[PDB]
Amino acid sequence: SAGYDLSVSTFSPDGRLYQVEYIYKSINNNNTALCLECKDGIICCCINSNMDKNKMIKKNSYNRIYHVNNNIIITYSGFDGDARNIIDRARSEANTYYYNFHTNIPLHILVNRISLYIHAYTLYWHMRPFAASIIISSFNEKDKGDIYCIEPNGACYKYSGIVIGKNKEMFKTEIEKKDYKDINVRDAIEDIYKFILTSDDHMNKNNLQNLVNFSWICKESSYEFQNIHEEILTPALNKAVE
Amino acid sequence: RNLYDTDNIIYSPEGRLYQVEYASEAIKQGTCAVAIKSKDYVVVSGLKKCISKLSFPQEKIFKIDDYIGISMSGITSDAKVLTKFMQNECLSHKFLYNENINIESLVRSVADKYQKNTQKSSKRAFGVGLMIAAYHNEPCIFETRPNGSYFEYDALSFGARSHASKTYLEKNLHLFEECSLEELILHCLKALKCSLSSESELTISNTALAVVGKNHPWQEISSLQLEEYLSKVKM
Amino acid sequence: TTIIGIIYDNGVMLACDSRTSSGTFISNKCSRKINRINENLYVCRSGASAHSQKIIEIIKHYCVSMKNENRKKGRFHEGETIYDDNNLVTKNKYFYEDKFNDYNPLVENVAHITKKIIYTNNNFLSCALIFGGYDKIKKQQLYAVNLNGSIIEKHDFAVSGSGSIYIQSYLQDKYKKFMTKKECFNLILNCVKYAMHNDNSSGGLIRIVNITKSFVEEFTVVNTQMNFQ
Amino acid sequence: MARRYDSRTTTFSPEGRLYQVEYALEAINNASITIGLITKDGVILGADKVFISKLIDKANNYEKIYKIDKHIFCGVAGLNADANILINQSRLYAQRYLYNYNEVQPVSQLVVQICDIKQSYTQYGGLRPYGVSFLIGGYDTKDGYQLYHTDPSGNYSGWFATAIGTNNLTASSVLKQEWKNDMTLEEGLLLALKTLAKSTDTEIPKSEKIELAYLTNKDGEVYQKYLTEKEIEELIKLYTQK
Amino acid sequence: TTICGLVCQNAVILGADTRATEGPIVADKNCSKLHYISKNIWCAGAGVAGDLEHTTLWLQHNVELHRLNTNTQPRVSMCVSRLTQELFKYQGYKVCAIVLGGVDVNGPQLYGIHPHGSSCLLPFTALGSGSLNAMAVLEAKYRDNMTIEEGKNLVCEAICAGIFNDLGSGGNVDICVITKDSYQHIRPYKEPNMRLYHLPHPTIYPKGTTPILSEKIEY
Amino acid sequence: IYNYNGGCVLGMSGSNCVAIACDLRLGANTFTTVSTKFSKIFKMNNNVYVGLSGLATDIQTLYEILRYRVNLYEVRQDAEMDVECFANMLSSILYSNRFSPYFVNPIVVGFKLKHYVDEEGEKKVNYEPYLTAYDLIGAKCETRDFVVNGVTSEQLFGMCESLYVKDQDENGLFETISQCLLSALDRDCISGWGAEVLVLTPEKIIKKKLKARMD
Amino acid sequence: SMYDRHLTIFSPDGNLYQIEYAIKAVKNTNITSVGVKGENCAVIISQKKMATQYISQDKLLDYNNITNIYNITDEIGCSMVGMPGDCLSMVYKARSEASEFLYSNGYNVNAETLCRNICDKIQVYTQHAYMRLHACSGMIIGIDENNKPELFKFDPSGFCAGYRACVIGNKEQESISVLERLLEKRKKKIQQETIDEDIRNTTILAIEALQTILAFDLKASEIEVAIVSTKNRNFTQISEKEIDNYLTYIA
Amino acid sequence: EYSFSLTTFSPTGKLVQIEYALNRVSSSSPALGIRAKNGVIIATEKKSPNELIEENSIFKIQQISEHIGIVYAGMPGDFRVLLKRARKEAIRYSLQYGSEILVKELVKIIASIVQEFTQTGGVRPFGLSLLICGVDVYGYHLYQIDPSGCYFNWMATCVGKDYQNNMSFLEKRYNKDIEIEDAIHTAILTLKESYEGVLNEKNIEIGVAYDNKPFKILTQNEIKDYLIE
């Protein structure tokens, strides 16, 4: 830390590479993002907690749920600009694959190419490393869904459900209570609200039709990306407890 | 602090990019600018700055396309680069195709122009925040921060005494149903006056104001037309 | 030259003559035209010999690059064990057979390899190719890459080369929707032999390659034609 | 951004000088000494071989007096490593002039070419200067025998006798006190030994040491260099008269 | 320009003529058209001698550099991919039909390159203007697994068929045997004799005219 | 090679000496002469003589390059450059312009300079002739005896074949190459306005300009 | 200046501390990967565990995905251990070389040439100060053209020695002793009639070494082996059903 | 702004970064070169390693060309990039001139490359010293290239750790007319005395020129006969 934490291209005497763990505390002070697999389709979640005091944003304008190829959900938790740079690069790779192969890019190599693009910035004097943790998901019928989480400095890791953001420790401990791989996707929306109401540090409280927004890729969406229509959110807002 | 400030690359031990947090407060020194979104109109007003009582008031409101206008607040030189970029973008789209540029897509096209000046170390973040107010098929207001970020609002304020003007807007929910622009333009002008310092210059015919709406292309409010609006503000 | 591809019930069969003629002179007999790209798909190459060979070299490089790229990380199919002649009637029928690396996780689709060509020879390059191989999703399939990079999936059969026109209607008649391996071999053998009897681009021996779900078998046949009329 | 890591090698000092050139001059003030001498017969260059070991070949080579062209040659004093960069460069210059104008390059024109490149590094580029300066003696049909002394700064000067290197003052003093305007070749050679012996405060040279060369144009620019054997006679002659 | 080569039981044999022509006339009767690529592979070529001679030099030294960075003996297929990519880039301008044969971890393999970049593995071949004449006698007499001695004199007949029947090829024949251990390159091998030999008649010393004689002695 | 600026270059090898010869014409068009001093034989080195024949623009332009690189090689070497190293350089220089050729047909003539002991008290040894001939794209047509290029290449081949004998001394070799050149230039109407035979030995170099027919 | 932060600048003792620090970065993951070389057979092991990094460790990750073993071509495989991003970047560079070598030379790259080419780039990092070393040390196995096994290890410092029983991880200081000792038992056994006994002489030898280098129990779901022996020459990951079969040869 | 020299003149007029590179060269295994009447010997000691390593897989004495060997003493990573770049020059030279490159021009070319990294920006000087030996038409040669880039002509030299007394040992045991067989005897002895814990077998290396024979590296069978004395 004694001058070894200035540039991303220097190793500290204890081997740990600074300027990257500082990013990790940048994303961990950002709005949380959630993504877990069910027996019908992946359901994601983004709780825009930092946008509660503003009271001026359009109701459901802000959205961190992006899709590529109409069958791959990409959500992030970090700098909303740096991540948006990657999505356009994720879309570029998907386009580049189709121009060559007549086929949507398989997810397991989309996360590989994105992991290299994100990591390529952690190798230079000048370049500023990205400050975004990327969650990528896709569901198929012959093979069930799968979730990858591309942290800063590469490290694409396959999950069965992940939370990244400020309270990711208090969300994981509540998600692992139930094996959601056997839980339906319609009734999993109710469950994640109970976590948002409780595990969120009073940022969201009973007025969250706008702060939190999310989407699935499930059978009722024909295994294609789809934001949940508002007529399904409110039945899932039967959160009246105590 | 002293070490984690020199370049726009180093992250503070709390993960904060100081050199874009510092440029994010250059907008906090520009004069106030207020945008109000009606059901089918958008009203943008900004306070021009006079450096001396001989100088002409500085221009605050800029026209981008037929139905797109902005109101910068920050470093004037940096904004002039962005207006030229936006103007050359709406025109090219109206040339390559025959449509009007998608305002949502145009904001993203300028929101990542902020970004490319943040990854590198030979560049600096733009010191200017914009107020992209437009009517594509529905009224909409955008705002771009010096760090790559943009949001769709229902009302804004920029910098100087924006907290004072926001209080007026935060407590006014009428603006959605505020048809009869007369009733809406007063709401914005009252908001701009709120930020304006008392025991100082009052809102005069040297404060910018423009509208855009359903069949109302981006137009300035002429001083003869504007003059009576200021009169109802005094009420 | 001539080049055939027939899709039978449980595989695809590729045949070709073996002769590179250079203006009414054969530069060499027994020139390979059924080129292996990957263990599960092969390529029939025609047109200008220089162009086709140098395209195949590029594609093999792409094929290798994309085969190991779409390799999933861990271990798969832990407990699964999904598995399953012509006896020299045609004289001097050489033969050997090799087996795949099954389940098809690593090896890539034929459609993937196919538009490499368009992306590569959408140029001023004269070569017409026929792609045939097995695939995990679309079982057996046969792509015909035309002169300027025009692929269309041929669900029944594909022909190319100079001698194709001489058996265009012979093959359209003898074809059946689901032919067995023996019928397909005889059909594809007689198609080439007839395309050779009446074309001065007739090969020497003819090389027939069969792609199935779990193996590829390759034959070379040394025979001529003698009509009785 | 390596701004903190830069040395600004091309930046003026508070007193209007350049520190990198200031130090480069110091580097060439600790190198072996080189002597230049113009006689009526020809121009004499003689430098001192810094001792390394008796295992040095010292038969067919020495690293102080190189050949730049058939009519130009130099005696280097400074960093031997980057001299070969400038020697090869000046060899290219003297051979490209002959390529364009179909005649050998005048000495005064090669020097300005090799001094422009030497100066260019201390003008722009952020690179270190060439810590090397060498006398460039040569014969040109226009202005006869010439002798030019270069500098890491890039500014040269014509001379009749110069003694750059370590202990140059004690060798310029003897040159200034004994350089007659009109000298014969053998007379100049003896003077070169006298100034080389006195510069390194030795009464007699050793011939496993300082080496000598000259031009003495004989309408064909003979350009001879001494093997050690011929210098004993020069050493013998010095002993007889001194 | 009559070059040929065939595959034998455990070695490759390359044969070539010795004659370079401006087209109406012959330049020299002894031109080494065989070329050393590496110790275990040799190449022979036809076409324009300009592109032909440089390409082999370019190929030999690239192979040698490859054989240094890598620590194994060069592969025959490595040069075929190297040449054909080089020949493919220059669409057809670097006109040089080349046969290169050698041995590697695989069997003794022989490749016939073509000016447009095409290549093919053959058991026996022949290029040049006398290729057709040389290829005929090759086919009439070639067998599989010929002994080195028996296959060596077959090339002698293969070349001599092009020596005699073709105008553009003639002179001595030279052979190279590219066995695994090393090579054997025999520079003269044929071209019989006993014609009317020219009587040497040197003009006497007091001939010529010499208006000027600027004698000088150098040292 | 062009009829424009018609000129030929001839080289021959003796017992222990080599002779290089050329014609001195410089013809502007095909049938129009402008100079008879245009020597096409250049001294690359003490025992490396190159003879350039063809278009005089490319004769001079190539000669500048050859002289610019031989000097660069020798000066960087502190060693005399030998023929077979120089000869291969000329082959690659011509090839580097494969598609914008130097329209010349060079001849390289000069001794080979073996370097065995020659005795218990000697250092260097006897010399070897080393004749060689090229074309515009640089094909090293090395030959143990006479080599020719130019517009009279075909005229010179016939005469040299019928007059050259195996080994000859300096006096004998000069006469044969002179007769092989004078009577070959007299059959060309675009070259041969005066010859320049240059026979050189390990010790001396002889320059003679023959009284050639000027027609 | 005092900036030994540069990737290249020699410290006054002649050392590049960044190389030492990058090597320390590989040890920090405390992931041990072991590969041994036998007769016409080579095997390689990793640990299938999360690299010791900032992110939270294994809770919902499907452990099948977490592997330290990749393959470069159909016949060349590697085990990169280091920072997960660098290891992923190293294989893609490695894959390109073996692919480019094939296209440019018409035959598959040697297992020794691929790592030498890799080291020729890791040197470029070591010498250019504008970038940073990949904190990745990898082990590469394969079969040469003589049907002989090959094992090579490279380091964040460009160094491509190539062993016959190699270990990478945080215990290489003492793992060099056991591996040397445990490999002598197969030398003391001079039966010399092992006909394709890679299954019961080499793979079991490597698993024994891992059980001894680090003193856990090696559950079959937390290790993985890969073998490029002759008669396969394909670098196939050995399935879990027979990995615990060797783990049942504790007897 | 990213290309500025990191090697700058110290106030006392010394390229201090080079002095650091020479410190590390003076701490590596001693390489050694000796030239004789009819050949050149380059020898280095490769410290007795663990039995895990394959000794032949690392060789500090590599070969540049047919008659030009090499050995280094420094960082092994830089030797490979320099050796590989040195072979290109030896091939590029031969692609112009027929003959094999000779040592004097090869050393000058390589030294110009070592000097470049000393001056150019953003890079560090090479941390090694080379001993290029070869056989030419101008006899035998033995050169040494410093990290600074300057090269020296030697008759016998050392570059490794404790080369001060190591080279002093050679001075009293070397003469110009030394037999090549005796040269190897002296080369072994000087390495033997410097190597603490003398076990000079399996941990030594020799490369010989042998009077215009191709450069050959003596395998250990041909070395044990040189360790008797």
Domains contained in chain E, CATH given: 2-186 (3.60.20.10)
Task: Give me the resolution in angstroms, 1 decimal.
Answer: 3.1
The candidate with the shortest Cα–Cα distance to F211, out of F187, F181, F170, is: F181
- Are G and H close enough to touch, i.e. 3+ CB pairs under 8 angstroms? yes
> Strand, coil or helix: what is B106?
helix
Residue A61 and residue D213: Cα distance in Å, rounded?
Answer: 86
The breaks in chain B (C to N more than 2.5 Å) occur after: none
Residue A149 and residue B206: Cα distance in Å, rounded?
Answer: 54
Contact B19, B124 (CB under 8 A): yes
Distance between E180 CA and the closest CA of chain C, angstroms: 26
Distance between B8 CA and the closest CA of chain D, angstroms: 9
CA dist D176 to D37, D149, D195, E60, Å? 11, 16, 10, 61
Lookup: tokens for D192? 């070169």
The CATH class, in words, for C1-225 is: alpha beta
Determine whether the interchain pair G74/C79 forms a contact, defined as Cβ–Cβ distance below 8 Å: no
Residue C63 and residue G112: Cα distance in Å, rounded?
Answer: 23
SS (H, E, C) B137-153: CCEEEEEEECCCEEEEE
Q: How many domains are contained in chain B?
A: 1
Residue H33 and residue H49: Cα distance in Å, rounded?
Answer: 23
CA dist C63 to C101, C112, D142, E84, F102, Å? 16, 9, 70, 20, 44
Residue A144 and residue A146: Cα distance in Å, rounded?
Answer: 7
Scan for tokens 């929707």, then name that residue: C177
* Helices and strands in chain B: count of H runs, count of E runs: 6, 9
Task: Show the CA angle centred on residue H129, arms to residues H124 and H135, nearest 5°.
Answer: 135
Lookup: tokens for C129? 């190719």
Determine whether the interchain pair G144/E72 forms a contact, defined as Cβ–Cβ distance below 8 Å: yes
- Are C and F close enough to touch, i.e. 3+ CB pairs under 8 angstroms? no
User: What secondary structure does DSSP assign to F158-189, as a single string?
Assistant: HHHHHH--S---HHHHHHHHHHHHHHHHTT-S
Contact F49, F109 (CB under 8 A): yes
Tally of CA atoms within 13 A in the half-sphere of C113 that contains its CB: 34
Lookup: tokens for B130? 């914009």
The number of angstroms, rounded, from the C-alpha of E219 to the middle of its chain's C-alpha atoms is 41
Residue spans of the domains in chain F: they are: 1-215
Strands E20-21 and D132-140: unpaired
* Backbone conformation region of residue F87, classed left if phi is above 0, alpha if psi is from -120 to 50, else beta: alpha
Inter-helix orientation angle A107-119/A80-101, to 10°: 130
- Could you tell me which residues come within 8 angstroms of residue H10 by beta carbon, excluding any fewer than 6 positions away? D23, H16
Residue B47 and residue D109: Cα distance in Å, rounded?
Answer: 67
**Element at F112 (helix H, strand E):** none
The breaks in chain E (C to N more than 2.5 Å) occur after: none
Distance between G164 CA and the closest CA of chain H, angstroms: 5
Residue A6 and residue A4: Cα distance in Å, rounded?
Answer: 6
To which CATH superfamily is domain H9-225 assigned? Aminohydrolase, N-terminal nucleophile (Ntn) domain (3.60.20.10)
State the burial class of residue H40 (Cβ atoms within 10 Å of its Cβ: 0-12, 13-18, 19+): buried
Instruction: Give the CA diameter of chain H.
Output: 60
Residue D162 and residue D135: Cα distance in Å, rounded?
Answer: 8
Nearest to D67 among F67, F68, F78 (CB): F78
Distance between C160 CA and the closest CA of chain A, angstroms: 23
Tally of CA atoms within 13 A in the half-sphere of E45 that contains its CB: 25
- Interface check E62 vs H, CB under 8 A: yes
Chains contacting B with at least 3 CB pairs below 8 Å? A, D
Scan for tokens 């040394």, then name that residue: C222
Sign of CA dihedral F206, F209, F210, F212: positive
Which fold would CATH assign to domain G17-247? Glutamine Phosphoribosylpyrophosphate, subunit 1, domain 1 (3.60.20)
Scan for tokens 């570029």, then name that residue: A92
Is residue E1 flagged as an active site residue?
A: yes
Residue G29 and residue G47: Cα distance in Å, rounded?
Answer: 11
Amino acid type, G28: N
Determine whether the interchain pair H24/G158 forms a contact, defined as Cβ–Cβ distance below 8 Å: no
Lookup: tokens for G238? 């050995």
CA dist H199 to C30, H33, H41, H46, H203, Å? 62, 21, 21, 11, 8
Residue spans of the domains in chain G: they are: 17-247
Interface-testing mutation among H37, H97, H153, with chain F (most F C-beta atoms within 10 A) = H97
Residue C189 and residue C207: Cα distance in Å, rounded?
Answer: 9
CB atoms within 10 A of CB A241: 7
From chain E, the residues in CB contact with C27 under 8 A are: 112, 114, 120
Chains contacting C with at least 3 CB pairs below 8 Å? A, E, G
Alpha helices in chain C (DSSP H): 49-69, 110-121, 168-174, 181-197
State the burial class of residue B216 (Cβ atoms within 10 Å of its Cβ: 0-12, 13-18, 19+): middle
Scan for tokens 């040929």, then name that residue: E4
Residue D153 and residue D123: Cα distance in Å, rounded?
Answer: 9
| Segment B106-111 long-range contacts (CB within 8 Å, at least 24 positions apart) | B106/B68, B106/B132, B107/B132, B107/B142, B107/B144, B107/B150, B108/A84, B108/B150, B110/B82, B110/B85, B110/B86, B110/B144, B111/A81, B111/A84, B111/B144, B111/B148, B111/B149, B111/B150
Using an 8 Å CB-CB cutoff, list residues of chain G that contact chain A.
3, 5-7, 17-18, 21-28, 50-51, 53-56, 59-62, 65-66, 83-89, 92, 130-133, 135
Interface-testing mutation among B119, B132, B153, B172, with chain A (most A C-beta atoms within 10 A) = B119
F201 phi, psi to nearest 5 deg: -120, 175
Residue A157 and residue B186: Cα distance in Å, rounded?
Answer: 56
Residue F58 and residue F100: Cα distance in Å, rounded?
Answer: 11
The candidate with the shortest Cα–Cα distance to F34, out of F54, F8, F6, F63, is: F6
Distance between B52 CA and the closest CA of chain A, angstroms: 35
Contact B158, B71 (CB under 8 A): yes
Residue F92 and residue G35: Cα distance in Å, rounded?
Answer: 50
Tally of CA atoms within 13 A in the half-sphere of E20 that contains its CB: 22
> Strand, coil or helix: what is B20?
helix
* CB contact residues (below 8 A), chain E span 87-106, against chain C: 88
Q: DSSP class of residue G61?
A: B
Provide the terminal-to-terminal Cα distance of chain A, rounded to the nearest Å: 48
Scan for tokens 């970049």, then name that residue: E117
Amino acid type, A159: Y
Residue H56 and residue H39: Cα distance in Å, rounded?
Answer: 24
Residue spans of the domains in chain A: they are: 1-242
Lookup: tokens for B197? 């310092």
The candidate with the shortest Cα–Cα distance to A137, out of A71, A78, A48, is: A71
Determine whether the interchain pair D5/G6 forms a contact, defined as Cβ–Cβ distance below 8 Å: yes
E strand map for chain G: 33-37, 42-46, 69-71, 77-82, 136-143, 149-153, 165-168, 224-227, 236-237
Instruction: Give the CA diameter of chain E.
Output: 69
Interface size between F and H, measured as CB pairs under 8 A: 22
Amino acid type, H1: E
Torsion on CA atoms B70, B75, B78, B84, rounded to nearest 10: 30
The candidate with the shortest Cα–Cα distance to H138, out of H87, H171, H91, H99, is: H99
Scan for tokens 């060499």, then name that residue: C28
- Could you tell me which residues come within 8 angstroms of residue H116 by beta carbon, excluding any fewer than 6 positions away? none
Interface size between A and C, measured as CB pairs under 8 A: 25
**Method used to obtain the model:** cryo-EM
CA dist A229 to A40, A216, A232, F17, F122, Å? 17, 11, 6, 101, 103
Residue B213 and residue B66: Cα distance in Å, rounded?
Answer: 11
Nearest to C119 among A99, A108, A112 (CB): A99
The number of angstroms, rounded, from the C-alpha of E57 to the middle of its chain's C-alpha atoms is 13
Scan for tokens 């002895």, then name that residue: H189
Q: DSSP class of residue B29?
A: G
Chain A residue with Cα closest to B139: A58
Q: Considering just the CA atoms, what is the radius of gyration of chain F in Å? A: 17
From chain D, the residues in CB contact with G130 under 8 A are: 2
From chain C, the residues in CB contact with E81 under 8 A are: 57
- Cβ density class E11-42: b for 16+ within 10 Å, e for less: bbbbbbbbbbbeeeebbbebbebbbebbbbbb
Determine whether the interchain pair B9/A26 forms a contact, defined as Cβ–Cβ distance below 8 Å: no
E strand map for G30-160: 33-37, 42-46, 69-71, 77-82, 136-143, 149-153
Using an 8 Å CB-CB cutoff, list residues of chain D that contact chain A.
1-2, 4
Contact E168, E34 (CB under 8 A): no
Lookup: tokens for C160? 């190319």
Interface-testing mutation among F75, F88, F94, with chain H (most H C-beta atoms within 10 A) = F88
> Strand, coil or helix: what is E1?
coil
- Bridge partners of B231? none
Torsion on CA atoms C17, C19, C20, C25, rounded to nearest 10: -140
* Helices and strands in chain F: count of H runs, count of E runs: 4, 12
Residue D82 and residue H221: Cα distance in Å, rounded?
Answer: 44
Determine whether the interchain pair D69/F75 forms a contact, defined as Cβ–Cβ distance below 8 Å: yes
Residue spans of the domains in chain C: they are: 1-225
Residue G155 and residue G123: Cα distance in Å, rounded?
Answer: 10
- Cβ density class A89-115: b for 16+ within 10 Å, e for less: ebbebbeebeebbeebbbbbbbbbbbb
From chain A, the residues in CB contact with D2 under 8 A are: 125
Strands E212-213 and E26-28: unpaired
State the burial class of residue C84 (Cβ atoms within 10 Å of its Cβ: 0-12, 13-18, 19+): exposed
Residue A165 and residue A76: Cα distance in Å, rounded?
Answer: 9
